[PDB]
Amino acid sequence: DSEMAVFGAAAPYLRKSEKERLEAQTRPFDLKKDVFVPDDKQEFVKAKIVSREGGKVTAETEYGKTVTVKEDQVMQQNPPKFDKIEDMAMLTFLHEPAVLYNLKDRYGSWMIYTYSGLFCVTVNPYKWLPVYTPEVVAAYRGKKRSEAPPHIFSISDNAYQYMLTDRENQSILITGESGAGKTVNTKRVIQYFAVILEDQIIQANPALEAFGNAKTVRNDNSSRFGKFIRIHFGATGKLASADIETYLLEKSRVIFQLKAERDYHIFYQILSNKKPELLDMLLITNNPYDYAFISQGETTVASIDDAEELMATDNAFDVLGFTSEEKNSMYKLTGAIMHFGNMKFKLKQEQAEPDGTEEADKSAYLMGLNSADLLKGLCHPRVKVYVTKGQNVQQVIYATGALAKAVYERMFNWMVTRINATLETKQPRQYFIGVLDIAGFEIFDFNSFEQLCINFTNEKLQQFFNHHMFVLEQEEYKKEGIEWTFIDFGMDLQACIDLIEKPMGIMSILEEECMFPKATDMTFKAKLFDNHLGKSANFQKPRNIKGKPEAHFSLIHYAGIVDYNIIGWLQKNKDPLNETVVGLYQKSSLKLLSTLFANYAGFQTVSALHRENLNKLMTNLRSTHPHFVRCIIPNETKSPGVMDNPLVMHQLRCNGVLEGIRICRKGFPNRILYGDFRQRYRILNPAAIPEGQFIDSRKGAEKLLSSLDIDHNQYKFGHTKVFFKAGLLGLLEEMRDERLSRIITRIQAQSRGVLARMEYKKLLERRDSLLVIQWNIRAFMGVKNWPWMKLYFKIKPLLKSAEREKEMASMKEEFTRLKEALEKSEARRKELEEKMVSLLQEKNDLQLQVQAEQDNL
Amino acid sequence: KVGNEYVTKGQNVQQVIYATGALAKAVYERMFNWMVTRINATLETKQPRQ
Numbered sequence A: 001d002s003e004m005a006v007f008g009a010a011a012p013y014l015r016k017s018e019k020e021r022l023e024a025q026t027r028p029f030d031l032k033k034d035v036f037v038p039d040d041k042q043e044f045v046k047a048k049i050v051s052r053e054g055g056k057v058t059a060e061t062e063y064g065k066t067v068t069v070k071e072d073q074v075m076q077q078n079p080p081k082f083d084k085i086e087d088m089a090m091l092t093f094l095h096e097p098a099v100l101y102n103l104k105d106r107y108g109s110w111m112i113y114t115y116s117g118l119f120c121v122t123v124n125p126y127k128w129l130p131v132y133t134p135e136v137v138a139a140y141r142g143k144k145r146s147e148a149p150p151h152i153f154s155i156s157d158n159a160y161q162y163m164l165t166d167r168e169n170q171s172i173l174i175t176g177e178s179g180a181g182k183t184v185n186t187k188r189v190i191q192y193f194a195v196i197l198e199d200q201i202i203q204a205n206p207a208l209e210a211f212g213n214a215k216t217v218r219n220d221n222s223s224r225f226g227k228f229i230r231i232h233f234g235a236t237g238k239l240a241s242a243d244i245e246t247y248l249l250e251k252s253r254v255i256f257q258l259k260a261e262r263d264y265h266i267f268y269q270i271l272s273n274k275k276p277e278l279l280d281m282l283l284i285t286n287n288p289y290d291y292a293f294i295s296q297g298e299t300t301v302a303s304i305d306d307a308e309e310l311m312a313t314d315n316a317f318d319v320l321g322f323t324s325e326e327k328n329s330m331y332k333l334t335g336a337i338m339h340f341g342n343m344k345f346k347l348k349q350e351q352a353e354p355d356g357t358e359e360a361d362k363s364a365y366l367m368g369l370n371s372a373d374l375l376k377g378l379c380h381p382r383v384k385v386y387v388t389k390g391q392n393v394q395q396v397i398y399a400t401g402a403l404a405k406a407v408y409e410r411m412f413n414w415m416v417t418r419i420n421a422t423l424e425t426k427q428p429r430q431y432f433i434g435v436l437d438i439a440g441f442e443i444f445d446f447n448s449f450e451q452l453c454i455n456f457t458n459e460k461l462q463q464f465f466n467h468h469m470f471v472l473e474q475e476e477y478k479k480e481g482i483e484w485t486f487i488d489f490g491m492d493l494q495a496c497i498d499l500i501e502k503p504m505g506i507m508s509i510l511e512e513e514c515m516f517p518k519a520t521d522m523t524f525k526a527k528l529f530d531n532h533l534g535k536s537a538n539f540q541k542p543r544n545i546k547g548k549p550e551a552h553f554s555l556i557h558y559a560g561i562v563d564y565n566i567i568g569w570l571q572k573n574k575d576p577l578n579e580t581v582v583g584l585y586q587k588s589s590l591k592l593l594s595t596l597f598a599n600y601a602g603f604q605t606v607s608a609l610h611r612e613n614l615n616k617l618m619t620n621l622r623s624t625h626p627h628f629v630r631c632i633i634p635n636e637t638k639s640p641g642v643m644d645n646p647l648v649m650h651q652l653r654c655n656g657v658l659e660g661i662r663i664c665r666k667g668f669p670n671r672i673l674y675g676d677f678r679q680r681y682r683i684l685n686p687a688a689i690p691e692g693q694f695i696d697s698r699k700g701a702e703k704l705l706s707s708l709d710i711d712h713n714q715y716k717f718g719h720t721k722v723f724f725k726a727g728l729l730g731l732l733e734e735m736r737d738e739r740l741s742r743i744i745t746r747i748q749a750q751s752r753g754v755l756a757r758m759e760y761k762k763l764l765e766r767r768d769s770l771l772v773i774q775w776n777i778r779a780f781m782g783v784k785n786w787p788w789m790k791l792y793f794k795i796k797p798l799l800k801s802a803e804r805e806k807e808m809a810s811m812k813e814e815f816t817r818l819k820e821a822l823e824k825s826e827a828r829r830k831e832l833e834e835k836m837v838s839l840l841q842e843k844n845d846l847q848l849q850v851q852a853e854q855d856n857l
Numbered sequence B: 001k002v003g004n005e006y007v008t009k010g011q012n013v014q015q016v017i018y019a020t021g022a023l024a025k026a027v028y029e030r031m032f033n034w035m036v037t038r039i040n041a042t043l044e045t046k047q048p049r050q
């Protein structure tokens, strides 16, 4: 249990226990006696095998109920060896009940992360589990998904491994219904990147979170804008400058909030009174109920304490390096917006007469200008012929709301730009990894233009997933000359997108009527009905319900039918403003309001910008190698552990995960280039593909594979990329690692051999020296025991041998010293000779240089 | 590389074939110049005096 010991706390929550699988193998089972049968309230139920009368197999459900049904919707249960399987591609039987029941089995053990073929699926646990510890992140470093339990950390690690190996961009895309957990997983991915500037990226997400998210019926932490976070890396394979891009912040939230929907987080974080200094300098109490814009929602969430969120976002701002002046500026603007919300107006003979201007004075003080000028601009708007115009009392409130939402949007863009500036670093950055977290699909009780935009973004993301996973993979199979029948998996959302995105479509008619002045909801809607009602499968008449608000029409996304009541979408897409107040805000005292807002009058519909951003984003994405994560919400009640079968079945059908797993298990998932394969797996059979003795790719790769003694029917050789059947690539990697280990061990053995060889040669020389010494000392003792030898042999060398024998020693040593001196002198003379040759070389070079200056003149 | 970002450029067949030709020209010119430098180094022996 090496993985268990390494993981520690998160081990039981990520990997099945050894005893658990041991008892699972002992669970009673058979090829027969096991089936899944459909049911109404629960989609599928386990059942036994009783009798097949006329082909009508009889099944006794686990609840005890017994019913006979024909061979249709009769699917064999998978063997218990596949219970709580980490990757769901090795299922011998694949069928709609099987995916649900394996997912539920893993969910019961709180195993949210599961691999469905190539991409990953995450079920919402609705409870923060101890799996995101930095120890687990370190354990998830440099590990394949096969050798590690499923987790988003493993997904990020595999993306980084591709990043390093193939030197190509990666894009981790999170897709699912709202509140499924996309933002949490994006935060975990950013955390994994930070662990392996890091504090800057960590705290940047809460900074935008505090201003973007709001509490909704579907989820309390509901993002109102798409996020694309790009982390750049250099050639060395280390983190570098980052970037964050936002998509279509829902500006209508400030003006209006639904009955069960709260407002933005910051408007109540500041009013939580955690820092009364904020209350003092903003001239605002801690009760949002006195303030019209932010009092429509509950302003209270059971799981959210706005004081903690406020201190967290302040800490994040400090970590990012936000100066106190700009923080105070945005705080003053946030105060000013509900100060504007406090505005009241009355008709008196025609422009509304201002009243209750004290709050207007306070707001003007916060932003910085003459309050009378702003009041007159709101009271008597002047626009391009600056000409005054009579307008209704109700219109001044709408104008103030539009100005407030525009100011909030500009402040949001300023935060985005400041985050980019803080994160940007001049250090080299080679490639990038893009994490995509769009606003998830959602079905509110009443839906409007922003809901339509969010759902259209979700539709386009699902269509991109379908196109890449199904169409492009099959076209790649075809192009490389691989025999493969074309299979249609049954989802092509291009028609649904073209219903609105393409010209003359519902969204296109929306921009066309927005350009058209005097545009009314009644007529424009008519322009929709005669255009696509009936003839378009998705669009249809509104399936109006008495409980739900009246809807103009109903249209079918990939996730189901949704009603879309249009109420003044033309003004929302057009975004009109009063030019007088525009001019007043342009020259405001505050740095933020003056710089940001000056480009409004310094048009293009926001829907057109949304479409262009989606097109550009997905064209950029197509250049990358996506990793998909699909998030499933188990229960609408936010109850952890409740695994509501019909909802998950509907989500699985809309997502089309089953067909993705089918195309992963049937087709060839792994495709590797011939040259890359040769240079990578040559260690398996180095004899094949001899080192630099020929030039050919296909033949060498074919010989290498044919020498690998595996199932040769798995791979179909192509023109440029050899394909691999599912599970083959990991096997080849396993034998490659084993062969590398064998090579390293043999290298160690050879190194030990040579070290022993040299040390034993040294031992030989030492033994020869010892023999010489011992023989000489033996002779010396033999001559020393002789009384004669010492007398004439100890004084002769000093005296008698000095004059005519030791003088040979003296002349020899002086010859040696003189020879050393002569050799050193001759070597010095030779090096001086070559040095003076070099001096000639450089002097003629310098005369050439002199000629060069005479050329210069 | 534009700025600090390595942006991949998309070119048609004409540009890529012209690039191949330019690479061939440049590498052969460097070939010729390296040959000239090599022969100059071999011939430029000691005592290039006077």
Ligand SMILES: Nc1ncnc2c1ncn2[C@@H]1O[C@H](COP(=O)(O)OP(=O)(O)O)[C@@H](O)[C@H]1O
Binding pocket: A124, A125, A126, A127, A128, A129, A177, A178, A179, A180, A181, A182, A183, A184, A185, A219, A221, A222, A223, A440
């Ligand atoms: N992996 C997870 N661990 C713990 N809670 C999670 C996880 N994923 C989602 N949740 C919870 O689910 C809810 C919605 O998750 P969130 O990421 O905010 O969704 P969305 O991306 O749709 O805004 C929150 O209550 C969040 O805490």
Ligand SMILES: [Mg+2]
Binding pocket: A179, A182, A183, A184, A221, A222, A223, A440
């Ligand atoms: Mg979210």
